[PDB]
Amino acid sequence: WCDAACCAAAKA
Numbered sequence: 001w002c003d004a005a006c007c008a009a010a011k012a
């Protein structure tokens with residue numbers, strides 16, 4: 001969390 005996967009999921 002608060003990583004590139006978190007921000008990719010938030011964007012998607």
Ligand SMILES: *Cc1cc(C*)cc(C*)c1
Nearest residue numbers: 001002003006007008010
């Ligand atoms: C703290 C944080 C930052 C991003 C880019 C995304 C998430 C889910 C949390």
